[PDB]
Design a protein around this ligand. Structure first.
Ligand SMILES: Nc1nc2c(ncn2[C@@H]2O[C@H](COP(=O)(O)OP(=O)(O)NP(=O)(O)O)[C@@H](O)[C@H]2O)c(=O)[nH]1
Ligand SMILES: [Mg+2]
Length: 195
């Protein structure tokens, strides 16, 4: 059987995670704010990829840390057309990166909503997310998770996925055992909730 990567799709509410997940799986669909999560599976090269699309609202965000132990990598989505929110997206990513289970895991950052006239380029989003100081491998890809009526999805989305998967693939020998071990350790400690 094939190797399995697990990925968390994170970013602030309204960034476009759920739409991006849909579009990456080939399906235009309607979306409402995620007050929980969506979960699906993708094929990319030699890997089966489990993707967890978590809600980004301020009252859902605390859930993210419950996944970081079982994840090999992150897709972080930013609404590139809303610089008003760059600073909270920066603080939100910082929190994820500070987390103990994030060390050495790669981040694919999608600068989403490039169809909007105010969309910031990759450079701007690097500044805005304060990535100059980030020491998790990362790359920023502009994209449009919501292409118009009738258009093909944006190839930039798979490009970003392929960079992520290739980065995980390159370290898989060290990363996967750590994920498996770290994940079970956390899964073990949540058996507690009876007491
Ligand atoms: N113009 C434009 N709008 C987009 C794009 N991507 C998503 N949207 C829109 O942005 C809004 C939020 O998208 P959605 O994927 O639900 O956001 P989300 O990150 O899952 N929000 P939450 O974290 O609360 O579930 C929706 O109206 C959606 O159609 C895009 O590339 N361009
Ligand atoms: Mg959503």
């Amino acid at each position: 059987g094939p190797r399995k990567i697990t990925i968390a799709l994170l970013g602030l509410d309204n960034a476009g995670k759920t739409t991006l997940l849909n579009s990456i799986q080939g399906e235009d669909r309607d979306t409402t704010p995620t007050f929980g999560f969506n979960s699906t599976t993708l094929n990319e090269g030699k890997y089966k990829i489990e993707v967890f699309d978590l809600g980004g609202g301020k009252n859902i965000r605390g859930v993210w840390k419950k996944y970081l132990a079982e994840v090999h990598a992150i897709v972080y989505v930013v609404d590139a057309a809303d610089p008003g929110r760059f600073e909270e997206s920066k603080m939100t990513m910082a929190e994820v990166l500070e987390n103990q289970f994030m060390r050495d895991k790669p981040i694919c950052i999608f600068a989403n909503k490039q169809d909007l006239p105010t969309a910031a380029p990759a450079a701007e989003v690097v500044k805005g997310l304060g990535l100059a100081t980030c020491r998790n491998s990362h790359n920023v890809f502009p994209c449009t998770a919501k292409m118009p009526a009738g258009q093909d999805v944006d190839h930039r989305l798979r490009d970003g996925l392929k960079w992520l998967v290739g980065t995980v693939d390159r370290e898989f020998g060290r990363l996967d055992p750590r994920v498996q071990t770290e994940a079970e350790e956390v899964r073990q400690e949540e058996a507690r909730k009876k007491k």
